[PDB]
């Protein structure tokens, strides 16, 4: 796996708030979430809300019948990441009581001024095999690739700020395995 | 183990002090304590006080008969993490002179601007056996899990700051061990 177009964060000459007087634009920086998963079925999500009274918008899938307990742990809020551009990042995390048939990897780097560190190479491989030598098994001949790559925030000359994401590359090697029942 | 709901810290739109003019809300940041322990009995605690004169509140369990020496090491301050919502994090640490039947791990990352760094994965496993191949043994057939995950402080539009905490997931594999006397 790698993030595609890491060099695009060196465009510091396109409607960016200056560092200081006569300066280059602020680059993308602040809160980042880098996350990727490979699985034999949909990623399973647990709902956690920063603020349980947040009205999530139409056309998004969010924890429902949310209570104050939803702000720490509410077991009602279970879902499959079965739809694109639907599950908002801030409400959902991989459910660690499930995902037996998935491997997931995620870093939240918080802070407002936090600098992006993005490594690229075509020489790194992750092994998806568990402690028993078994990788994700693809039910119905389907592979599930899930990603989040919020790189940080873009500050236009106004001073207002937008999340900026990048595409993630996946290369998965699979092999046939016999299984019973 | 992992922290559940790390992505909740991307809510920078819910009564946050703006970074600057027109900007996003300041994310949870600053002092954090991430601790977890697995034992066959209560985690054993040593009291150490920033300030021996502090009045701790009714309903809480804190070092009693504090003296100036309580600000470095007073051996009177011994206790069992035997009750939830009672032992103030700031007064107590694991007592390294005991805890033979527990494994504890913790990080204090202090500072006011310190960014939260939180890793999630279902691929990492801590081994609880000691140098002699023995893990915690569960007296009275009871497993003790202990945790703290103060992620940092949330700054509201007034400038006041609250500690924000998150839940912790534990999965513990146990086996049956014969023991004498």
């Amino acid at each position: 796996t790698e993030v595609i177009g890491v060099t695009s964060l060196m465009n510091v000459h396109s409607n960016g708030q200056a560092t200081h007087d006569n300066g280059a634009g602020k680059p993308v920086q602040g809160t980042s979430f880098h996350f990727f998963s490979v699985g034999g079925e949909a990623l399973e999500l647990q709902g956690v809300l920063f603020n349980y009274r947040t009205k999530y918008p139409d056309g998004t899938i969010f924890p429902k019948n949310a209570t104050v307990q939803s702000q720490v742990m509410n077991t009602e809020h279970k879902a499959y990441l079965d739809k694109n551009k639907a599950y908002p990042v801030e409400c959902w995390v991989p459910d660690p009581t499930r995902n037996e048939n998935t491997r997931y990897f995620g870093t939240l780097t918080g802070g407002e001024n936090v600098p992006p560190v993005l490594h690229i190479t075509n020489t790194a491989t992750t092994v998806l095999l568990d402690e028993f030598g078994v990788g994700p098994l693809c039910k119905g001949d389907n592979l599930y690739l899930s990603a989040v790559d919020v790189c940080g925030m873009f500050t236009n000359r106004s001073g207002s700020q937008q999340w900026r994401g990048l595409s993630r590359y996946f290369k998965v090697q699979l092999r046939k395995r016999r299984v019973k029942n | 183990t992992e922290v559940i709901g790390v992505t909740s810290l991307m809510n920078v739109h819910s009564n946050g002090q703006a970074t600057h003019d027109n900007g996003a809300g300041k994310p949870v940041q600053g002092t954090s304590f991430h601790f977890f322990s697995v034992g066959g009995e209560a985690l054993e605690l040593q009291g150490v006080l920033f300030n021996y004169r502090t009045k701790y509140p009714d309903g809480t369990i804190f070092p009693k008969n504090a003296t100036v020496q309580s600000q470095v090491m007073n051996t009177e301050h011994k206790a069992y993490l035997d009750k939830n919502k009672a032992y103030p994090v700031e007064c107590w640490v694991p007592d390294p002179t005991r805890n033979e039947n527990t494994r504890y791990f913790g990080t204090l990352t202090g500072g006011e601007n310190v960014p939260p760094v939180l890793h999630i994965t279902n691929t990492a496993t801590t081994v609880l056996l000691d140098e002699f191949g023995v893990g915690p043994l569960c007296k009275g057939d009871n497993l003790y899990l202990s945790a703290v995950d103060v992620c940092g402080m949330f700054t509201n539009r007034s400038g006041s700051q609250q500690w924000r905490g998150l839940s912790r997931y534990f999965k513990v594999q146990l086996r049956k061990r014969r023991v004498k006397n």
Epitope: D58, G59, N156, R157, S158, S160, Q162 | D21, N22
Partner: antibody
Framework: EVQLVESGGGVVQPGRSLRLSCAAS????????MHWVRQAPGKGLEWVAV????????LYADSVKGRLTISRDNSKNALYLQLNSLRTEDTAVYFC????????????????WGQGTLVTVSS | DIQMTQSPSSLSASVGERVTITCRAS??????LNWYQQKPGKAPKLLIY???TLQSGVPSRFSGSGSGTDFTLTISSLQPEDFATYYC?????????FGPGTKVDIKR
């Protein structure tokens, strides 16, 4: 020639509802965020609401939040304002104006306006 | 919210004059400043956006300068259709806020 033509204005009692609409032409309507801006008789201009090209995202001034609903039908090149729970103070000319390009940055200015339609709240 | 103030309340001028109206933001707003003309009973028309860009089809005699708090609209050679009310509007913060207006009448 860009053309914006409001309608639906008139007399309405406090507490009741009126629905404004705007016919837009001479530009690619579904590529533009749109605004309602109002002008009370003899006073200045006050921004009321914006809507995304989508139709799917609305934002509102504090003075009108909870009482107004902006919406659109890009199939019919139509922009709507729905006024509810009205108060005499909401009396004004209500104008249909196109977003100047800055919607996504929250930097609103108005490159084309309609003739306006007069809403009078009175018992 | 940003408060916008305008140069004089009212101004008397005559065809051919150089006319100046100023606008002041209650805080630095960089060049996110806009000028509209409004005739009695009519819809506002955009003259200038980003403090100094001439909206298409607006005559070159209209010009704009300023950055930060202080802004000026300038009509080099005033004409009979330039008699109107002039509004400035900050596009820098939400909500967008307008000046109180500058009415330009005919000097008698």
């Amino acid at each position: 020639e860009v053309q914006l033509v409001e309608s639906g204005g008139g007399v309405v009692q406090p507490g009741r509802s009126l629905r404004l609409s705007c016919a837009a032409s001479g530009f690619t309507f579904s590529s533009s965020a749109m605004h309602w801006v109002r002008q009370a008789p003899g006073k200045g201009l006050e921004w009321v609401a914006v809507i995304s090209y989508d139709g799917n995202n609305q934002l509102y001034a504090d003075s009108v939040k909870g009482r107004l609903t902006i919406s659109r039908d890009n199939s019919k090149n139509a922009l709507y304002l729905q006024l509810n729970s009205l108060r005499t103070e909401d009396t004004a000319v209500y104008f249909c104006a196109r977003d100047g390009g800055g919607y996504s940055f929250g930097t609103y200015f108005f490159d084309f306006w309609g003739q306006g339609t007069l809403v009078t709240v009175s018992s | 919210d940003i408060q916008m103030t305008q140069s004089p309340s009212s101004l008397s001028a005559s065809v051919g004059e150089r006319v100046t109206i100023t606008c002041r933001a209650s805080q630095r707003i960089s060049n996110y400043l806009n000028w509209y003309q409004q005739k009695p009973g009519k819809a506002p028309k955009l003259l200038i956006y980003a403090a100094s860009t001439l909206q298409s089809g607006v005559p070159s005699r209209f010009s704009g300068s300023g950055s930060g708090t202080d802004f000026t609209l300038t009509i080099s050679s005033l004409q009979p259709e330039d008699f109107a009310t002039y509004y400035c509007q900050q596009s820098y913060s939400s909500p967008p806020t307008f000046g109180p207006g500058t009415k330009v009448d005919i000097k008698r």
